Write a protein that binds this ligand. Structure first.
Ligand code: C5P
Ligand code: C5P
Ligand code: C5P
Ligand code: C5P
Lengths: 487, 488, 487, 488
């Protein structure tokens, strides 16, 4: 691939920063492409382009906007397999995942918001015969989205779909680890008829390009997906610069509670899907699995059985369902967590090492890893690993497990396995998390708002509420009576 | 003098463990109203633990049980309106003619409004397929903190605490160090109304310490702040860096008042007066850039002079007084520096511009009502919020021009237009970059109407149904009744 | 008491019909009172009064209306016991019910709507830069409620609360069987500050006073509670006369489904409360109880045990929990249904006869009655009895009981008893009823919309939606661009 | 000539078993366009069992699957716009200049609108206490019936079927016996888009038989009817008497157009023209009572006559034709009876009042554009809907008077005001008793905007989000997780 350029105002354009970076294929170590990095002057160009495109976009009818987003949806469906293969090359996720999930659910959200544009309404409030109020849900203007590397094009769609549907232009910065699919999406939008400037894509690094966006005085909102620490830095700079509105989708340490009446085959299946999809690189993963003491030994055997069925290998093979981690530096961090678990006395049930042999020595592979006999003070239990590392924790009673599930600064997701009507709702209602699954894990419908409690996030994505949160309310009073001054 | 004022934690007054105190002054006389204890770091932690325990009791009650308790507080506030207004006048220097008609009346209106909406707070249900559906809960945030400003102390305490409590939260409120007294009275009223202990705690103190300890505390889920634009940026930064708190910010503005070429100039002048000189100019939404057509500027200036001459400064408890001192001598000094900036930058002084002198004024920080004209967009008095009684009059030629100039600011709080024309009123208002827009009026802020700033003037909103919802957090719950399939 | 008069424009006034009727105390057979009947001229006077009052009422602020309704609530709480005693004399329901339910839940709904008045808002819809639409939710004007006799004051509150909260005036006609508490409510409203004419009460008979209301050209909506047959007459006349909006809360034959995993003590408690409260005179009663064949014998035993604890007697006694039927003519109809059950081959498990002895010979008593071995073709199974008659039906599988529960023209309520998460939601989602209870029966929160599918009703009561349904939408387009004529 | 037209049941054309047929006439020539089979009792029974089967398949699909199928129907309607418009012109007599720009365009706009809203159709969740909560489902009604009118045949079929299908129902549509042809084309288009067989069935026939059989059928859950005020009352009665069906009714009106004393009279004249002579006056919302201030009446009359003189009747397929014949010869007879009453009751005829004559008109149901003035509130032409091209001009003196006279009617469908004044426009409109109100325009009916009548002009609404919800029924579900308490 040739020097990948910036995408500004409906065309690829060379960056004026003079800086570049490389994205690596995590399966081979090869350079996928050299990518231009947006400089401070490039960000300002992108903002002025976005201001001009947004005015055209907002002036269109609601249904005209809806039709253009729907054309982008149709193109995404057509190009699913091509885009999935590129995503696999950039992220290391198996094609069996990227071709079935990444673009499908990204497009599902764009399709959803495309249809809701005409339903975006203000309100009207009578005060008295001589005065009333009405409100408008106006675009914020130019907004910025900052993506993460685990679901690059899905995240770009989940941020840009409500932003565009609400009448804004978005400047999107993909993660430096995985910048390629965002640039393809930018071409797809314009091909669908999106006006020039409404979706600009600026590859770059967080310390420079990301910061230039968070500081710009004419960007009205920042939406960020990433780690808890990076989020705090982003939200601070966005505030100190121009008091921007903020959305944050950060990591978690989500609990999966297995009830005493749970079927352990189902619970083990849910625990598997909550830990080893995308090689464990999912913010919502149920990485603390609480199991009753009386069932723990049997559950551990059922986990070992299923871990043995995991099929690592060629990411383009049909039967491969486990990939390398997104990068070699990230594998290093995941390995440090694994060593921490060993040094603190957690019992390694399986995995714990890199994969070796033909087809693995050149990739950032980590074996599916399960620790058991875990306790609430362990580093692997307290901190998000963002790798394929399950922690199993024994518990005795329902009140106890609720307290321990909630005793964390994280708040993203949670789940319970139980056939009992009262227990399922009763437990779920007490858990301090924004995304809660009963007898399942991971499904995130376009209709369902998702985001974190406590340190796991600010605001929400998806659902009707996220379309409204990309508008700002203007209240208008019409006074038809005589105005009275006290002077 | 009043008795020494303590912290209010868990349904009773309690001594601070900081060992620190400050004084609140009567802005009209300079006398010490009271010595006030300042909450330390340990006091904030005690307040948070009290709030956590109270919130659980409050949230477990029925919706209508909560509604009835807030309504009892409303009834008390109506009965004690005049007494609370007199205290507010002593602490702020605002005339009783204002405080007895606006401050508690509109604060209680918002509490009364939210009290009735508690039972209407609902989540959603979304079918996915025959075998699965989603439902959502609007759950309390938990413990939230409000940080008040000094210009409308008890109104702000009510506008923040009413939706927070109605949504099932406990709130720790920190009043401005300038004006702590009515917030402590409000805490007693809530308890008398039946609010569980800990649900509304009040921590007087100074911003550098008590305010910071609240924004840093790991177990406070949301900060709501009212104040200046600069102070706002600092609060929002500390709230994010510490524990990623949800935030609401109601900051200042430089709001434009646009007088159309077809406006009646008596109405326009009355609106401009009320948009600049209420509460002695100490109002975030004031219309401090008055745009008038060139052809009408001379006549408009004359009508402003007539009305400014009628402003009545004097005894703040007298019925005919409608203008008070500024809240402090340091704040007046800043307003005086802006006025001197207007003179040196070439704006024409139409009236006022000086401190008030003589018996009854020497002990207060009074500034005469001030009007500048012949102003231009580059002047400091036109670009920056003064927060004093200083009107800037700007001439303009055409509608496209005035919309551009009205919007060419980092502020975004309020705006208004004066015109009898249907098309012009809606057409102009729709293009203005502000959250609060008034047509042929100024200042009215109904409990139903969400209010807040665009751009640097704010984050989020207050009042209206949406502010009840914004004090909850959404939990989405998927019920999967079909057999779960694992790909491993 | 005296000769009960009409209530028009804030005062008691003599009827101009020249006609009266009597309401009987169902416990003694004695005449409680003679009540004047509103004629066609009385209805026209009530309507003109309502038009005048509604204009005053709607011109008030929203919070002014809220406070007045709240004062009525405070009065109702204070006079709960007094009002309940009057209700017991008129209806025959035990004081243990009327003092705990009738006024309490009537007032709860009024209290609920009082608080929602300020939240009643229209909408605003941008079309293009030069045109927008806004809507107003305007009062209907004058509406009429026609109450039933089983819950006289509760029904008066449930109809009048949303109607008044929406800015309307209501003319209320109580059932001729039970007119007394409705007149008390009219006094309470005026004492609370309700403008004269906003709530007028016209006692009379359905054949005359009710028909005059449904025919009046200046009444905008009729809300009716009663039997299915009477409802069809009312809704037709409302259509033929002036095309009125209509709400109908009619009877049902609601199924109670006991699952194979149900606790039979719980199922029996639910079945008892679903059949014998208010002596079986409740539209929502679960009068078809479906029980699995394998448990039928045990369930019947548990029902008989609980039936033996039912305490009929002095309606003002604390421990009395069962009363006479509302009238002797109604008892005659209930007895005919019981004899049909006997003759069609249903097995009589208990009851089936009037009660005899000192204190019962003078009242319209029917013993708690249970039939079992019932089949879907029996008259007692297909038709609403509106008396204390439980029908127990055996079933074998889940698909069958859903088909049989739904195989009816009625659609009011339904319920299931089961501890299983999937079974509770799965079954309830398939039942064709508007009011569904899981592991409970009867609770009707002010927040919860209630009403019938199929022949059991039109529209809903309670919930936010019922406040909205007492307004009518006006859409207003503001065209700020130049209008183009093609002529 | 066209082939004999059959019923459309379960995804295919099928012969009626009634043994009866009727003819639809081309109103421009008097010729038979087609012979059309009429559905009997048994045909209606068969259509219902088909609809019951199809609805189950349709409702079981996901929301977005339903959305995509309706969007494909939209795409076909856009592609086939001109062909469908030409057929509508043949059946109705409306000029192609109208049908190709409005009828299918706005019909498809509403289908497109509801297609996108399907995934947003949500129930509610209500917490009661920690141990119990309520949630609601918005379930399909099942099989619903739509009964169309003849003035906008395919638009009405789309406005009724779009929310009904989008909400998960099947609809059986009966077109007017006057204009059955475009509804049958719509049924084929729906199937081509993937609509499951049975979800949209079409039963041509006459009101006394096919219409009544539908309103009486026990397994139809809701009836939506558009037509005349009298026919509506009969439909609503039979629907109640049979099985207590939910009802929607869009009936006629006598809508007032109020010209204010400050109105520009050219704008007022253009609005009045569009409010009276579009579709040859056959529009339920037409502004047939034009209220003009006395001081402007003579001049207003002159501007109306000038614009009436520009009306171009002729070949309905010509670009410049903008006026057509009435839909049928019996309908012209009724319009002529109303015109004669206006003359006999003393109203002044300004123009028109007779049929059009000559080559190209003698065989069509033509009535000249007609304007009466000096009208009074007691005249038959002022009190009753004519549904032809007859404008009544009424003088007035003051605003209170015209509001009272505008409202002094049993009709309530639409209304409008012409004024440049902000206060006058909103003030007057807020007092008018009509569901559809236009300020400085007439006739536009956005898919987003609920429309329907006050008083005798209707029950319920069409279009907007509320109409999607009104084609569902609410089920409230209480989950009790606490121990149930029996008093027995
Ligand atoms: N929830 C998470 C956790 C980590 N990450 C990514 O992994 C990197 C390494 O993780 P930490 O910086 O959290 O140690 C982050 O900088 C970020 O790029 C993420 O994108 N989302
Ligand atoms: N919008 C504003 C602006 C200023 N202020 C007050 O004024 C101070 C700023 O100093 P001056 O207003 O004296 O220039 C703030 O720290 C705050 O106490 C406020 O409370 N709200
Ligand atoms: N659901 C029901 C059923 C009957 N009823 C009353 O009972 C009458 C008919 O029932 P009976 O034939 O049992 O007397 C109705 O006209 C009405 O007065 C009622 O008010 N609600
Ligand atoms: N609003 C209206 C008024 C009349 N009509 C049609 O006109 C008929 C009434 O006869 P005339 O209109 O020919 O007088 C109705 O039965 C109906 O076919 C309509 O479809 N909509």
């Amino acid at each position: 691939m040739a020097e990948q350029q910036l995408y500004i105002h409906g065309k690829f354009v060379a960056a004026t920063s003079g800086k570049t970076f490389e994205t690596i294929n995590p399966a081979t170590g090869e350079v996928l492409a050299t990518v231009q990095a947006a400089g401070r002057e490039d960000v300002d160009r992108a903002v002025k382009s976005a201001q001009q495109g947004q005015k055209v976009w907002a002036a269109m009818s609601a249904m005209a906007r809806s039709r253009i987003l729907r054309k982008a949806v149709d193109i995404l469906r057509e190009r699913n397999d091509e885009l999935a293969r590129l995503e696999t090359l950039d992220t290391g996720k198996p094609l069996s995942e990227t071709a079935a999930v990444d673009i499908v659910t990204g497009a599902d959200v764009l399709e959803y918001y495309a249809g809701l544009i005409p339903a975006l309404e203000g309100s009207q409030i009578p005060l008295r015969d001589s005065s009333f109020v009405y409100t408008r849900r106006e675009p914020l203007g130019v907004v910025a989205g900052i993506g993460a590397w685990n679901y690059p094009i899905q995240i770009a769609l989940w941020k840009s779909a409500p932003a565009l549907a609400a009448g804004n232009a978005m400047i999107f910065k993909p993660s430096e680890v995985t910048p390629l699919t965002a640039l393809k999406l930018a071409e797809i939008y314009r091909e669908a008829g999106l006006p020039d400037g409404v979706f600009n894509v600026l590859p770059g690094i967080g310390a420079e390009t990301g910061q230039y966006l968070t500081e710009h005085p004419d960007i009205a909102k920042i939406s960020f997906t990433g780690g808890v620490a990076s989020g705090k830095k982003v939200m601070a700079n966005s505030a100190a610069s121009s008091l921007k509105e903020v959305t944050m989708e950060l990591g978690g340490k989500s609990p999966l509670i297995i009830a005493e009446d749970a079927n352990l085959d189902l619970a083990a299946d849910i625990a598997m899907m909550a830990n080893f999809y995308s090689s464990g690189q999912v913010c919502t993963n149920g990485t603390r699995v609480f199991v009753p003491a009386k069932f723990k030994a049997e559950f551990e055997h059922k986990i070992l059985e299923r871990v043995g069925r995991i099929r690592a290998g060629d990411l383009f093979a049909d039967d491969t369902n486990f990939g390398p981690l997104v990068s070699f530096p990230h594998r290093q961090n995941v390995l440090r967590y694994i060593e921490s678990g060993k040094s603190e006395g957690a019992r390694l049930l399986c995995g714990g090492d890199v994969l070796k042999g033909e087809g693995f020595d050149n990739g950032a592979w980590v074996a599916p890893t399960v620790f058991t006999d875990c306790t609430d003070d362990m580093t692997i239990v307290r901190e998000e690993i963002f790798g394929p590392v399950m922690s199993i924790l024994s518990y005795d009673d329902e009140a106890e497990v609720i307290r321990r599930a909630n005793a964390t600064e994280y708040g993203l997701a949670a789940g319970v396995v139980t056939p009992d009507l009262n227990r399922a709702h009763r437990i779920i209602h007490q858990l301090e998390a924004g995304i809660c699954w009963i007898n399942s894990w991971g499904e995130s419908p376009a209709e369902m708002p998702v985001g974190g409690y406590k340190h796991s996030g600010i605001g929400r994505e998806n659902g009707v509420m996220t379309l409204q949160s990309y508008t700002q309310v203007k209240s208008i009073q019409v006074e038809m009576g005589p105005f009275q001054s006290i002077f």
